[PDB]
Design a protein around this ligand. Structure first.
Ligand SMILES: [Mg+2]
Ligand SMILES: [Mg+2]
Ligand SMILES: [Mg+2]
Ligand SMILES: [Mg+2]
Ligand SMILES: [Mg+2]
Lengths: 56, 192, 166, 55, 273, 188, 396
RNA sequence: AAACUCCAUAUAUAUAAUUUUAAUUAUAUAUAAUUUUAUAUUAUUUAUUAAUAUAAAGAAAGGAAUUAAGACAAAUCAUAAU
């Protein structure tokens, strides 16, 4: 669920650093935002299931 | 609904009018029908289902799953003939095919004559009545290949009308002397 | 290409014999009890009836040992009764087990029997505990009343283990 | 939301009392015949005297 | 009517096609104890003109059978017709299977057209049991056309808040139910399959429910107020199902960016109709 | 223009009709299993078509997950183990939930669909019964009297020209409506 | 609410179109000569959109539409009963029971009864007349209420066609068998099978005239009744008959005409729907279709025009002609050389080109047999050992 | 041999009164790709040509089943049948 705003992210109701201990996963999450340089323009609410850290 | 007592008795047997009436009084008008795309239930064609069609509906009196007769109600007692033959013309000939007939099967000269008339327009009557056939050599010929010895039938034949016309032909086959001599006779007729 | 279509409405009588075997209704229980009685009595259900037209070849295979190896014999063809004059068996125990739902529950054994057996007190207490354990563990096993009773008695310690046909 | 309410709040005024039955019936017939009965695809299923007609 | 074939006496004046299809019926039925009958023979000789066959042939065929046919003709079947060239007068077996599929379809469609409408006579108004007065639910299972043992199982489920128990007896009931009560849903559930037929299993569940209710109502000797309720089995259940409880933050919602509805006069000028 | 085609025959050519749920209680749950989704879905459509005429709100053919048995076996009668071949078996599951319907109507639905069950399909029916906390289960005389009266009023007969009957059902009613059955209760 | 004022609003918009402060724009007839026509244009464009929705959401046609065609509609369906073999037919036993043990029991019973049926076919008449009734495998159908055993049978020699109606006055050694299968009252074999299956049983001996219409009957007949013609060597006359049982059909032309016929079917249904979409709908005003969820066009007779049981059913059926067959004789069919011998007789083709140019797609039976192929092996014993007749037939 | 096929891919449509919730799902049907173009450069059967360059548009990239004829008197009479 992406809605314009600041740079806030909630993954499965948990903080990004809490859910993803790996830095590369957080960078991968960001990548679209930085290619469009809208990292601080949208709030992301992500809910995932299945696979592992990389897959999610 | 669509038609209430609108001459419906003239179009459907009296035994079904009760079912139609019940349907009219249970399914409401303005029902928002929708065709089904997942499953298919109705035939691709249009039918009122009021007549039992032979070859398209189960034959009454003959056992079959989805039957409603008891074991003491079956009315089929002879099995020497094919139940439920084909409808319409009773035949399924493809386009441009003919039912097999004699076709001069008693004499391969007829087949040779028909083929040569087809290919080059010579007279089948002349080939079939005024030509005489005579084999000269009928022997087995072998070729050695990777798989092994492949035997072949070789025939040579003279065909002549006993009035000046004469020719000879050679024919090689892989299956039978009869086909070998057929080919030889074909070639001879060509080479009169 | 035309043949008349004869109709016969699906009345509940016609749809009978195909109601669910286990339904939440006293009426359904009664109907299913009657159907089970017919099946056990060998009514011509699932097959053509026997009417007195065939005199020599009127056979059936529903012998008491049908489908069972233990007796030992070939397929027994038994002359079958005509549709009439067929005795139907109704077991009151079967009724109170399919319609009403009564169960026996293996009426317990109390201290008096075991005290009569043995004078010691610890043995009596242990035997009572044994009987309780067997009582509450032998119900789940699908078995007949008489045989389950005999097993319960033997394992409690009333009957000798020779009653089990060692 | 910014247009339709203003336009719809004027029908109460424009109704007035003038006779309309005939005119509105004719207009409705016009809509049925033209807008609702136009045939997008028709049917069940000369000499080129002048040259360069497209010209 | 049906028994006509068993009475060769009344085979008089019937059309030849009816004398036949009755002689054949008597031969098909009575397959092993068929006996020659002068009435059958006499009724059959009337069909000599129908089938264009001599009566002297009919008599000896009746009295001999296939041996009679091989007597009429000479040597037995000799010509081999097995490999006769196709006449295109018959359809392969796989084609017949497809045709049978269509026949089944047409059967069921005729049913849906004319027979299903006739069972609307049995429509009934649904009398809903009062949910206040019917809190318990009994579940039965049936396997049509089978002997599955599970067909003997019966389940009972109710909600504790709908038992009619005051707080103390309700607490006692929950404690005594132990693992058969999940507080998160407040449902008491118990099943029985230890008797051969459902009638008993249902009675047994009902009896246990009554016994538990009686003990719960009896708070003279002990009420188990000091004992709190155990939830460890529910925790174990919860750990085994993935939970999705997170909800979208309310302050992130921005209705002021939703798509508006554009104005078009086509609908406003065509909706009057 | 042509001969009329009434609604009953026009319904076959469209998706089956459903009746809305007005309370929401689940009376029955029929799960259909087969190795052939074709017959499975065809028969499910037939069920949903009969339910409408019989007045039973049916939800529809919910596709439950299919179950794949797998085996692996060597291709040779004797030693060739480096070559193996896999075999599978798919079980397809559909679910039809019947809400807000009387037990007798539901009974007759199940009976009719059993009458006309296809080949290669299997039905598992879960019936739900609402009940009160305490049940009077000692009723014998009036109990069975009312039960047999209900049997009689249900399995009645009024038309003798049309319709069909089962010998088994006839005998069942015959033996149920008998004085010997009346005394069979408590002859003890 | 009503356009009586929206008209004035749009007139003001036209004034603005010319200039925001001008009285009015270029008006031939006070903006009525062609402004009304443009309004009608947009209305009819809306009709176009709604109309193509109308047709698309009410489409269902058999598969077989060649993509090259233009009038073909977007819809397609291969599962028509007449154009594919239901996968339940793949397995000789067609059952599902929630009790796996009962399922195993029933398959055992099916196999044993099938072998009994085989053994129950041979017949004697006079000790020098041996009649064998070749029968295919049994198709066991296990519905929830009744069991059905269906098979195809071919008598070794039907009574001579030239023979008179004398057959009407006696029952053949085969008619007796087929009658005792299910017609005898309390003696039929179905009654006995009911004990093993605790269900109502039925049997269907479907008759076949030619042996090459089925792979089972054909191989069985060669392996059981034609030994003498290939024991010491395949007879040339036998080979000739076996190779000319069927003519040389043009598979390409057959497939092309089948696809063209399906194209015609779909296109004429499409035309029926289009003429109901345009010619009709006059009296019934628009917006009554409620295209959001309702899609009812009109009378089913008009949606299905000139599509009766007399023309549509037969021309769409598949697997109708035999366009190829292979026979393999393998084993010790030779007194000389005392070794194994294989002889293959292959005629016709083994590919259905119907699937090659159309949208109809092949389905593999048991995931390894193409739908168009039916094959069978039959083994028998001669004085030298065992020998196998393997037959493969391709139907188009 | 390729295609057709099955597991996977995307889209849609239909079912589930979202308390068999996994609707982030299940499986029935259809569509899609054995990818299209646009200018570049070498060339060259001349343009009708390929190998690349890669502006663009696309979600689009895999896997397995199928291993012919002949042979090695290859293994199998211990899967069973002979
Ligand atoms: Mg779980
Ligand atoms: Mg390939
Ligand atoms: Mg090879
Ligand atoms: Mg060795
Ligand atoms: Mg052995």
């Amino acid at each position: 669920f992406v809605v314009r705003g600041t740079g806030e992210i909630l993954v499965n109701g948990r903080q990004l650093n809490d859910y993803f201990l790996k830095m590369k996963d957080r960078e991968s999450i960001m990548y679209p935002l930085q290619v469009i340089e809208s990292v601080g323009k949208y709030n992301i609410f992500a809910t995932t299931s299945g696979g592992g850290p990389t897959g999610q | 609904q669509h038609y209430d007592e609108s001459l419906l008795s003239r179009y459907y047997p009296e035994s079904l009018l009760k079912s139609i009436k019940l349907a009219q009084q249970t399914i409401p008008e303005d029902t928002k029908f929708r065709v089904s795309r997942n499953v298919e239930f109705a035939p691709p064609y249009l039918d009122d289902f009021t007549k039992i069609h032979p070859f398209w509906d189960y034959k009454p009196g003959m056992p079959h799953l989805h039957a409603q007769e008891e074991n003491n109600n079956f009315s089929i007692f002879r099995w020497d003939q094919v139940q439920q033959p084909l409808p319409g013309e009773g035949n399924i000939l493809p386009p441009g095919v003919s039912l097999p007939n004699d076709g001069g099967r008693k004499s391969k000269s007829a087949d040779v004559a028909a083929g040569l008339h087809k290919q080059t327009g010579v007279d089948p009557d002349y080939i079939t009545r005024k030509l005489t056939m005579k084999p000269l050599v009928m022997k087995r010929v072998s070729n050695q290949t990777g798989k092994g010895k492949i035997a072949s039938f070789y025939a040579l034949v003279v065909v002549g009308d006993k009035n000046g016309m004469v020719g000879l032909g050679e024919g090689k086959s892989r299956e039978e002397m009869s086909k070998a001599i057929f080919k030889a006779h074909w070639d001879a007729v060509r080479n009169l | 290409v035309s043949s008349e279509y004869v109709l016969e409405e699906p009345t509940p009588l016609s749809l009978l014999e195909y109601t669910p075997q286990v339904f939440p209704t006293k009426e359904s229980r009664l109907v299913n009890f009657t159907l089970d009685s017919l099946k056990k009595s060998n009514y011509p259900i699932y097959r053509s009836p026997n009417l007195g037209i065939l005199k020599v070849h009127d056979f059936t295979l529903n012998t008491p040992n049908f489908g069972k190896y233990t007796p030992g014999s070939s397929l027994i063809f038994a002359k079958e009764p005509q549709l009439q004059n067929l005795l139907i068996e109704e077991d009151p125990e079967d009724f109170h087990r399919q319609v009403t739902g009564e169960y026996q529950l293996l009426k317990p054994y109390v201290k008096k029997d075991f005290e009569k057996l043995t004078k010691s007190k610890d043995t009596v207490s242990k035997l009572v505990q044994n009987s309780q354990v067997v009582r509450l563990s032998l119900q789940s096993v699908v078995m007949g009343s008489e045989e389950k009773k005999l097993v319960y008695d033997v394992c409690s310690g009333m009957k000798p283990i020779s009653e089990l046909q060692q | 939301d910014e247009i339709l309410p203003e336009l719809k709040k004027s029908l109460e005024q424009d109704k007035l009392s003038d006779k309309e039955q005939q005119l509105e019936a004719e207009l409705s017939d016009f809509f049925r015949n033209y807008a609702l009965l136009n045939k997008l695809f028709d049917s069940k299923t000369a000499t080129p005297t002048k040259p360069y007609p497209n010209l | 009517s049906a028994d006509l074939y068993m009475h060769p006496e009344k085979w008089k004046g019937l059309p030849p096609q009816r004398i036949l299809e009755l002689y054949w019926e008597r031969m098909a039925r009575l397959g092993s104890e068929y006996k020659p009958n002068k009435d059958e023979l006499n009724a059959l000789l009337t069909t000599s003109e129908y089938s264009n066959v001599p009566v002297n042939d009919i008599k000896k065929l009746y009295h001999r059978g296939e041996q009679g046919a091989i007597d009429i003709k000479g040597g037995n079947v000799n010509r081999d017709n097995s490999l006769r060239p196709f006449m295109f007068d018959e359809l392969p077996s796989q084609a017949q299977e497809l045709v049978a599929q269509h026949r089944e379809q047409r059967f069921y469609n005729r049913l849906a057209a004319y027979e299903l409408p006739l069972l609307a006579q049995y429509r009934q108004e649904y009398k809903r049991p009062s949910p206040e007065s019917h809190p318990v639910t009994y579940r039965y299972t049936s396997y049509v056309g089978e002997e599955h043992p599970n067909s003997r199982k019966v389940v009972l489920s109710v909600k504790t808040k709908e038992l009619g128990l005051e707080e103390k007896s309700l607490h006692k009931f929950r404690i005594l139910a132990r693992s058969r009560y999940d507080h998160t849903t407040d449902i008491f559930k118990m099943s029985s399959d230890k008797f051969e037929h459902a009638s008993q299993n249902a009675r047994y569940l009902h009896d246990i429910l009554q016994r538990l209710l009686a003990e719960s109502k009896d708070l003279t000797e002990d009420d188990f107020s000091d004992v709190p309720l155990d939830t460890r089995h529910t925790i174990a259940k919860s750990l085994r199902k993935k939970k999705r409880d997170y909800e979208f933050p309310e302050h992130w919602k921005r209705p002021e960016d939703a798509p508006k509805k554009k104005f078009d006069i086509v609908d406003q000028l065509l909706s009057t109709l | 223009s042509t001969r009329p085609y009434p609604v009953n025959v026009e319904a076959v050519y469209y998706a089956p009709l459903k009746l809305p749920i007005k309370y929401g209680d689940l009376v029955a749950d029929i799960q259909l299993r087969s190795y052939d989704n074709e017959n499975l879905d065809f028969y499910s459509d037939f069920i949903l078509r009969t339910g409408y005429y019989l007045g039973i709100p049916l939800t529809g053919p919910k596709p439950l997950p299919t179950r794949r048995e797998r085996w692996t076996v060597i291709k040779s009668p004797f030693v060739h183990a480096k070559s193996k071949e896999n075999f599978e078996r798919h079980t397809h599951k559909r679910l039809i939930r019947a809400w807000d319907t009387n037990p007798e109507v539901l009974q007759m639905l199940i009976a009719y669909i059993t009458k006309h069950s296809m080949a290669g399909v299997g039905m598992k029916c879960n019936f739900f019964q609402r009940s009160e906390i305490s049940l009077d289960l000692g009723s014998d005389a009036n109990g069975l009297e009312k039960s047999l009266s209900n049997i009689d009023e249900l399995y009645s007969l009024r038309n003798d020209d049309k319709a069909q009957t089962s010998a088994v059902g006839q005998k069942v009613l015959e033996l149920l409506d008998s004085p010997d059955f009346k005394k069979h209760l408590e002859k003890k | 609410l009503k356009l009586l004022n929206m008209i004035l609003s749009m007139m003001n918009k036209t004034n603005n179109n010319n200039n925001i402060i001008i009285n009015n724009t270029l008006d031939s007839l006070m903006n009525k000569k062609l402004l009304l026509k443009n309004m009608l244009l947009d209305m009819n464009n809306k009709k176009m959109n709604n109309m193509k929705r109308m047709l698309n959401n009410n489409n269902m046609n058999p598969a077989g539409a060649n993509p090259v065609v233009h009038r073909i509609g977007p819809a397609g369906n291969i599962n028509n009963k007449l154009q594919h073999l239901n996968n339940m037919n793949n397995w000789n036993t067609q059952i599902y029971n929630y009790n796996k043990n009962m399922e195993i029991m029933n398959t055992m019973n099916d196999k044993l009864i099938n072998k009994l049926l085989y053994k129950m076919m041979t017949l004697k008449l006079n000790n020098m007349n041996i009649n064998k009734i070749i029968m295919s495998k049994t198709i066991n159908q296990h519905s929830l209420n009744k069991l059905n055993i269906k098979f195809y049978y071919y008598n070794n020699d039907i009574n001579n066609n030239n023979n008179n109606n004398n057959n009407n006055y006696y029952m053949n050694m085969m008619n007796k068998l087929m009658n005792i299968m299910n017609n005898n009252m309390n003696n039929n074999l179905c009654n006995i099978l009911s004990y093993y299956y605790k269900k109502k049983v039925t049997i269907e001996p479907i008759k076949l005239s030619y042996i090459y219409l089925n792979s089972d009957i054909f191989s069985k007949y060669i392996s059981l009744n034609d030994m003498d013609k290939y024991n010491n060597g395949i007879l040339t006359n036998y080979q000739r008959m076996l190779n000319n049982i069927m003519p040389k059909l043009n598979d390409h032309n057959i497939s092309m005409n089948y696809i063209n016929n399906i194209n015609n079917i779909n296109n004429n249904k499409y035309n029926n729907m289009i003429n109901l979409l345009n010619n009709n709908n006059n009296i019934n005003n628009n917006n009554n279709y409620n295209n959001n969820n309702n899609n009812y066009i009109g009378n089913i007779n008009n949606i299905y025009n000139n599509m009766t049981i007399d023309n549509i059913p037969m021309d769409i059926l598949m697997y109708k002609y035999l366009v190829g067959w292979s026979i393999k004789f393998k084993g010790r069919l030779s007194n000389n050389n005392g070794r194994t011998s294989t002889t293959n007789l292959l005629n016709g083709t083994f590919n259905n080109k119907k699937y090659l140019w159309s949208n109809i797609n092949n389905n593999y039976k048991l995931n390894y047999i193409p739908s168009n192929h039916n094959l069978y092996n039959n083994s028998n014993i001669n004085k030298n050992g065992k020998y196998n007749i393997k037959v493969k037939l391709n139907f188009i």
